[PDB]
Amino acid sequence: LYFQSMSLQGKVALVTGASRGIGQAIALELGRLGAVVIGTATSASGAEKIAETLKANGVEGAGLVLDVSSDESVAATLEHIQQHLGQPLIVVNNAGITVRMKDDEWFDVVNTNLNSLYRLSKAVLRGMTKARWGRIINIGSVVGAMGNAGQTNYAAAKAGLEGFTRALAREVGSRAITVNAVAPGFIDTDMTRELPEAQREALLGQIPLGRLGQAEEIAKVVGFLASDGAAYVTGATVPVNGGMYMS
Amino acid sequence: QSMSLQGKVALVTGASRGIGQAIALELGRLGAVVIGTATSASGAEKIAETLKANGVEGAGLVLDVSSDESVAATLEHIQQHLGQPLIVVNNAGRMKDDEWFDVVNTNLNSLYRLSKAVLRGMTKARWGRIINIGSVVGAMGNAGQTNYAAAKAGLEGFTRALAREVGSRAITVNAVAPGFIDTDMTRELPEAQREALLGQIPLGRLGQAEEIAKVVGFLASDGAAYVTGATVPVNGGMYMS
Amino acid sequence: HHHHHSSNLYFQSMSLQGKVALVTGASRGIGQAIALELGRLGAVVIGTATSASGAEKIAETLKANGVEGAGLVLDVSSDESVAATLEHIQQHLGQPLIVVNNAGDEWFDVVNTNLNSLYRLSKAVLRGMTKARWGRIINIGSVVGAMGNAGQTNYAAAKAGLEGFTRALAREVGSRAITVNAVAPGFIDTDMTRELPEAQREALLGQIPLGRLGQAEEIAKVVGFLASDGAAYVTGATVPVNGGMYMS
Amino acid sequence: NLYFQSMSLQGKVALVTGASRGIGQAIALELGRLGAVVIGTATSASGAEKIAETLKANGVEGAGLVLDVSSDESVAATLEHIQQHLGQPLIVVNNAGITRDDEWFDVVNTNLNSLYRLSKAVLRGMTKARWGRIINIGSVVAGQTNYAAAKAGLEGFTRALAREVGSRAITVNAVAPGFIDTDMTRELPEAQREALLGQIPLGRLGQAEEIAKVVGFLASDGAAYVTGATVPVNGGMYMS
Ligand SMILES: Cn1cc(C(=O)Nc2ccccc2)c2ccccc21
Numbered sequence: 021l022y023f024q025s026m027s028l029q030g031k032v033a034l035v036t037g038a039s040r041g042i043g044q045a046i047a048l049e050l051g052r053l054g055a056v057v058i059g060t061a062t063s064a065s066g067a068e069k070i071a072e073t074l075k076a077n078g079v080e081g082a083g084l085v086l087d088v089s090s091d092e093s094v095a096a097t098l099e100h101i102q103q104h105l106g107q108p109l110i111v112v113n114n115a116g117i118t119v120r121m122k123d124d125e126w127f128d129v130v131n132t133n134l135n136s137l138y139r140l141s142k143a144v145l146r147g148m149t150k151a152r153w154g155r156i157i158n159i160g161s162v163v164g165a166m167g168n169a170g171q172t173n174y175a176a177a178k179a180g181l182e183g184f185t186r187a188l189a190r191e192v193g194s195r196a197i198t199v200n201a202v203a204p205g206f207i208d209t210d211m212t213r214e215l216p217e218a219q220r221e222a223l224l225g226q227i228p229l230g231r232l233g234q235a236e237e238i239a240k241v242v243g244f245l246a247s248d249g250a251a252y253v254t255g256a257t258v259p260v261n262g263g264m265y266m267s
Numbered sequence: 268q269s270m271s272l273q274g275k276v277a278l279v280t281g282a283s284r285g286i287g288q289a290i291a292l293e294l295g296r297l298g299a300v301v302i303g304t305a306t307s308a309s310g311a312e313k314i315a316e317t318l319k320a321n322g323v324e325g326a327g328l329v330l331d332v333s334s335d336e337s338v339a340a341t342l343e344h345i346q347q348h349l350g351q352p353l354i355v356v357n358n359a360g361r362m363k364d365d366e367w368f369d370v371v372n373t374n375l376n377s378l379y380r381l382s383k384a385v386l387r388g389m390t391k392a393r394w395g396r397i398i399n400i401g402s403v404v405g406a407m408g409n410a411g412q413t414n415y416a417a418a419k420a421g422l423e424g425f426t427r428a429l430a431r432e433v434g435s436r437a438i439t440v441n442a443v444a445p446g447f448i449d450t451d452m453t454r455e456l457p458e459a460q461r462e463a464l465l466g467q468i469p470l471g472r473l474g475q476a477e478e479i480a481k482v483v484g485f486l487a488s489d490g491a492a493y494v495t496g497a498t499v500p501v502n503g504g505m506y507m508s
Numbered sequence: 509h510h511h512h513h514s515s516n517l518y519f520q521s522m523s524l525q526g527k528v529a530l531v532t533g534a535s536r537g538i539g540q541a542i543a544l545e546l547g548r549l550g551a552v553v554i555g556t557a558t559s560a561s562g563a564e565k566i567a568e569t570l571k572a573n574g575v576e577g578a579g580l581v582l583d584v585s586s587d588e589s590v591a592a593t594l595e596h597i598q599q600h601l602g603q604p605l606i607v608v609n610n611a612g613d614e615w616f617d618v619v620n621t622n623l624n625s626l627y628r629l630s631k632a633v634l635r636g637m638t639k640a641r642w643g644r645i646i647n648i649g650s651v652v653g654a655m656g657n658a659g660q661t662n663y664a665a666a667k668a669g670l671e672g673f674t675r676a677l678a679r680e681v682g683s684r685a686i687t688v689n690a691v692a693p694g695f696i697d698t699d700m701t702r703e704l705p706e707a708q709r710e711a712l713l714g715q716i717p718l719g720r721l722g723q724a725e726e727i728a729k730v731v732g733f734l735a736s737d738g739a740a741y742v743t744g745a746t747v748p749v750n751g752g753m754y755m756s
Numbered sequence: 757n758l759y760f761q762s763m764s765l766q767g768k769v770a771l772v773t774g775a776s777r778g779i780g781q782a783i784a785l786e787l788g789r790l791g792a793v794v795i796g797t798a799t800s801a802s803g804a805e806k807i808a809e810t811l812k813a814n815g816v817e818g819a820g821l822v823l824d825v826s827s828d829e830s831v832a833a834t835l836e837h838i839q840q841h842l843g844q845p846l847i848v849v850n851n852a853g854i855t856r857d858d859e860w861f862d863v864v865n866t867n868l869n870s871l872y873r874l875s876k877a878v879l880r881g882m883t884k885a886r887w888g889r890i891i892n893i894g895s896v897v898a899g900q901t902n903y904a905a906a907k908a909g910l911e912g913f914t915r916a917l918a919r920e921v922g923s924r925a926i927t928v929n930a931v932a933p934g935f936i937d938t939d940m941t942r943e944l945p946e947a948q949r950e951a952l953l954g955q956i957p958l959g960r961l962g963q964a965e966e967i968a969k970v971v972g973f974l975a976s977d978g979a980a981y982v983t984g985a986t987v988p989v990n991g992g993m994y995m996s
């Protein structure tokens with residue numbers, strides 16, 4: 021057998037929302053570390069793009085279609101993964117939010133997200149319980165709109181993510197399964213490049229590092245949490261925001 | 268890897284035993300040149316021997332973080348003989364019910380003093396990593412919970428404030444808050460106290476010194492460059508404050 | 509089976525000027541005490557329970573303490589129950605401008621069900637508060653709730669949800685001069701906690717700096733303050749009322 | 757019975773530091789209104805005089821004294837003078853700030869040393885009476901850094917002291933104001949003011965009196981199970 025810091029050789033990782041941005045970068049980073057990676061999207065064209073992306077970077081795995089809002093989609097996708105690859109022991113929940121946004125959208129957004137986390141988490145626990153090992157990692161939503169509406173939704177989503185992460189970690193810990201979260205700040209993605217320049221330039225002034233974070237910078241934190249060295253880290257939400265904190 | 272610290276000098280205080288030692292070895296494993304410190308000459312010597320015995324380049328020196336003179340002189344010695352430390356880990360630190368105030372105040376004064384003195388070099392290089400290690404859980408009574416919570420709160424606020432001050436310079440400042448770790452202090456707490464702490468830990472075990480160190484090594488890496496002002500708890504799911 | 513039961517001295521505590529307050533889960537403990545304290549402060553109080561016999565007990569309790577108001581049946585998990593009860597209250601007493609939500613594997617569903625209840629009831633009373641350009645919504649957390657190990661998970665989760673929810677709703681409705689706050693009780697003196705054996709009780713007390721259980725009345729005074737004009741700049745806050753015992 | 761309970765402060769001596777203007781003044785008047793005998797303090801003789809005049813003009817019994825909370829000598833002597841002439845202060849509100857002009861660290865360190873000094877000195881009297889209220893007022897809203905740091909220290913300190921003294925039926929709490937209408941905030945340019953307002957859900961500045969009502973509640977018998985808490989009074993604007 022092998023035994024190395026940071027290596028995920030021989031593990032199957034499931035990464036939801038893997039077709040663009042943060043999710044893509046997470047998939048490639050777990051690939052780089054030796055995991056067999058199943059990335060998912062909500063559509064066939066995204067699943068295809070994921071597979072192509074993985075192949076082009078020499079990562080074994082697949083792209084599949086998964087709707088985390090559906091008990092059926094989740095059970096079937098898991099069974100398919102079990103049949104063809106094995107039990108995913110590393111699961112990164114990144115699949116999230118589907119006029120501009122307002123300060124009254126928080127409730128639904130957060131409720132729908134945590135129902136999805138719970139559903140998928142619950143379904144992969146059986147396999148992690150059997151192996152007496154696991155990593156669940158929840159990715160929070162990026163800071164996405166500049167005003168009060170945007171600050172409200174972001175803070176609410178971060179708060180739910182934290183409480184949920186901490187509670188699940190407490191339930192499953194006795195089985196040597198860690199549950200953590202990563203809370204990104206202002207990241208360079210498709211959403212943030214197409215904010216108007218006034219809203220965007222205002223955000224830089226609130227960030228001590230004086231830059232946007234990169235998708236890869238979220239992914240390195242996730243890859244660490246997945247490793248054997250982060251085994252005593254559980255129930256934590258690691259903020260990755262260049263020093264700007266808004267709750 | 269990209270976890271690599273090849274070509275960097277790291278200073279790790281309180282490096283002669285437990286968590287500090289394990290931090291020194293882990294930064295060594297990652298390729299840093301490591302200066303570990305203790306409060307006595309024999310500890311400095313033990314550090315050097317420990318580093319040699321694990322194939323890590325660096326040294327052991329004597330440092331009293333409570334003293335402005337000790338700090339200035341040690342830094343100047345490090346500057347003369349090996350270069351500017353761009354990774355600095357502050358680890359050097361029954362209980363009493365009124366001891367909290369002085370304990371915390373003394374710790375944060377030590378953090379500030381040492382941090383301030385190494386900033387000049389990090390500012391020049393336009394790069395740095397400062398990592399603050401909180402106190403391990405173990406203290407017996409209500410007194411012990413009080414001191415732990417107070418020390419964690421101070422550590423967090425301090426870490427966050429310093430991170431804001433120095434961030435424009437691409438220096439990150441973070442903290443690691445250990446829970447119940449297997450060390451010299453904990454390995455013979457009475458069994459009732461130990462069992463009680465286990466029962467509050469979801470993972471159902473003590474953490475290892477190495478498990479704190481891996482977190483520190485990650486924070487020091489280029490891949491943790493957007494993490495700053497954070498206190499990362501490393502406690503197996505046991506949260507108390 | 510009746511589901512609506514109603515009930516020249518001028519006490520100086522009466523600064524609530526006949527305002528109508530709705531207090532869910534008002535038949536026992538903390539909820540009862542909140543109902544009486546808002547009564548003492550001069551509000552017209554509608555306390556609710558899930559059954560007709562509870563609604564009756566509420567009305568009897570209010571009458572026996574000289575508080576105007578009623579006991580009604582309300583199921584906060586039901587859109588129909590909430591819409592109908594509110595309309596009944598509107599028709600017979602007026603718009604409730606003070607609303608205290610106290611009616612409350614396991615960990616997940618408990619918190620999710622609770623916050624859905626808070627949201628439902630809160631959303632339904634907002635129209636009337638918006639019209640009056642004044643309101644107070646106060647959310648009562650899970651009493652401990654959780655004693656040793658497995659329970660504490662449920663308590664911390666419920667507190668985290670309560671706090672984030674409270675803070676978000678407060679941001680949404682603030683421009684209308686409606687405050688939204690929460691009160692997070694620690695270990696409160698009830699039937700359950702009095703009948704613990706002395707060893708278990710002494711151990712619990714040793715975790716509480718004040719060295720005693722809190723009283724129901726002591727939660728209620730906080731709620732009554734938050735409902736007042738003087739707490740008008742307090743919004744989005746969760747006020748812990750736990751004698752110094754903080755469980756993270 | 758139900759109706760006559762009151763959480764008035766009749767028969768208690770309250771000490772309020774920094775009482776000559778704004779928040780501190782309004783605290784002094786609110787504890788006066790509630791029936792306490794109030795000693796307000798300032799760092800100068802002219803402030804102590806203004807305090808006494810203010811109290812007299814609102815029919816509140818008490819005094820204005822000079823107190824420098826950064827000085828062990830000033831604290832001991834003032835307390836002894838209060839003990840001799842009025843009685844043991846059992847309600848103590850720490851509102852007096854201290855400036856250093858690396859600011860972030862020294863400001864917070866100087867403040868908490870003040871809180872600790874004064875708190876320690878008034879504990880003997882509260883211990884003797886087996887009753888007390890200590891209330892710590894945070895700073896009103898680089899600037900975000902100093903505010904967050906000062907708030908974090910205030911919280912941890914408040915919580916630790918509360919644990920130490922609780923067995924004696926003394927509560928220790930804090931009030932963290934957001935953007936309040938005071939002398940400092942009445943001179944902001946409109947762009948900076950509008951920006952702050954747009955971050956405040958209530959859409960207005962808080963009043964001094966609104967901080968004071970929270971303090972007066974915490975001082976009452978009905979807040980007796982509230983300890984170790986920091987109550988934010990910021991109209992829904994939370995800076996972490
Ligand atoms: C709908 N919703 C759920 C929130 C939430 O935090 N839920 C939660 C917490 C802990 C454990 C399990 C669930 C939550 C938080 C803020 C706003 C809305 C929320």
Ligand SMILES: Cn1cc(C(=O)Nc2ccccc2)c2ccccc21
Binds near residue numbers: 367372417422864908
């Ligand atoms: C003496 N003391 C200082 C505490 C503390 O929080 N200091 C601090 C905070 C932020 C920045 C700089 C300094 C602190 C916290 C809890 C208990 C005691 C404390």
